[PDB]
């Protein structure tokens, strides 16, 4: 299917006690493969997936240099931004940067992106894709003019459409044992009557990768149901993910309702109903 | 492979 690799960066100011805290992490699809944390003793970009430990020290020395560089630009920004927003020295503020590149089944480039946010809000984002920038406000407009003048988009394009994709392919190839794996979900169903008269069916979906999944409900006279409760997909911890959908129905009939699951791991859509 | 270019201050 489609794949991607993303890099997330977060810096948080701590006026009065140390330099901003910086945490960088890298992903391929739904799997984290690297991290960096200013508060760790290491001061290096560390591996977080088996298939990445194979890269030689030239790679580590390299990613370590780069990430420090991101970190340093963020420390400066924090400063600049207090200024654009006329904020006091006392407050703590957050800068965030996210970029990466998507590929299709053909392992060819689909799209690139590079977004930036301040105090939890969109600051500036590279269009989808272009040389173009979307600027949230008077402050972001300044940055826009600066970055247009310096051709930051052109540099980012070279990366996103070039390097980013090639290293995505390299990792998918190396970590084929993991990243191409497709784990079909294990599905059980639990029953709970709400003090009689009515009843709920909980359609469980466990041990699957990747996270993208769809489980839905439907009935006899017509399909679809918007009177259903479904929790956001959650990580089990072992590398797989979990999710379930619950629907409220009358104690009578019961078996009348059915639950269909969809996932690339499943060749043909699963559908399980209630049984005594 | 992280971005080696196109990373400037705001």
């Amino acid at each position, epitope marked *: 299917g489609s794949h991607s690799m993303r890099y997330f960066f977060t810096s948080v100011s701590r006026p009065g006690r140390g330099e901003p805290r910086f945490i960088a992490v890298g992903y391929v699809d739904d799997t984290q493969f690297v991290r960096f944390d200013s508060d760790a003793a290491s001061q290096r970009m560390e591996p977080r997936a088996p298939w990445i430990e194979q890269e030689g020290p030239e790679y580590w020395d390299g990613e370590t240099r780069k990430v420090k560089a991101h970190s340093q630009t963020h420390r400066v920004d924090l400063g600049t931004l207090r200024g654009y927003y006329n904020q006091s020295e006392a407050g703590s503020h957050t800068v965030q940067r996210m970029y990466g590149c998507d590929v299709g089944s053909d392992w060819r480039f689909l799209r690139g992106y590079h977004q930036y946010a301040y105090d939890g809000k969109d600051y500036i984002a590279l269009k989808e894709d272009l040389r173009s920038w979307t600027a949230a406000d008077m402050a972001a407009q300044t940055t826009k003019h600066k970055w247009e003048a310096a051709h930051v988009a052109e540099q980012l394009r070279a990366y996103l459409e070039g390097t980013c994709v090639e290293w995505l392919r390299r990792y998918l190839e190396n970590g084929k044992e993991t990243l191409q794996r497709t784990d079909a979900p294990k599905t059980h169903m639990t029953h709970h009557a709400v003090s009689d008269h009515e009843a709920t069916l909980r359609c469980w979906a466990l041990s699957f990768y990747p996270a993208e999944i769809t489980l839905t409900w439907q009935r006899d006279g017509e399909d679809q149901t918007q009177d259903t409760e479904l929790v956001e997909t959650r990580p089990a911890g072992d590398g797989t993910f979990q999710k379930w959908a619950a629907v409220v129905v009358p104690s009578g009939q019961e078996q009348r309702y059915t639950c269909h699951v969809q996932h690339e791991g499943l060749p043909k859509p699963l559908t399980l109903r209630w049984e005594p | 492979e992280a971005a*080696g270019i196109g990373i400037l201050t705001v």
Partner: T-cell receptor
Amino acid sequence: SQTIHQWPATLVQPVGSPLSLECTVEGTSNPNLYWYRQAAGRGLQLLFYSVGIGQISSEVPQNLSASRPQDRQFILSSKKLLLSDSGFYLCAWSETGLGTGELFFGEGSRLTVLE
Amino acid sequence: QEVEQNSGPLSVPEGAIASLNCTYSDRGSQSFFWYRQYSGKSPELIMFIYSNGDKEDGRFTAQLNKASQYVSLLIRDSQPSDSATYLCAVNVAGKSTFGDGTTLTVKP
């Protein structure tokens, strides 16, 4: 240079001398600063890099030290030199971050260590 | 070995076109450069380039071919003052790695 200045320009010293090279930059801020070295035959070897003030990285086992006591002041020094230390030492800076990556060099400091 | 560039000295007659090549091994590299260094002086950037294709500025033309890991500099209408050593550089791993440089001499 307008943007970056380095000194002394030429140094002839005996083995065992202490070394001190200074580099001052101007026209930018929070710059990436570099100590490169051009030894036997052209080719710049990176010796130290620094993303910011008080932050120094040594790229190789070495008889030298660098320091950045200030934003735009950069120093390379040795308690005592070895013949191996002769070379053309170059200070350089690059825009804060990871931009195009271009470097701006200083005039350069030529060091000859005589026996 | 990491950035590889033919040592000089290459002769070209005044007015002719000089061509210099450089190859890099690390596909991590994301931007590429040409510095010029005269005897005694520090290097001075002639050009940089970060996308497949050719880039022209005056008599100088850079060529990058990320597929073959090949960077080139061409000097149109070479002059004696173009005699210098040309350093090819590759921005990789957060630093600039340099070839040992190629020496050019434009015979008048």
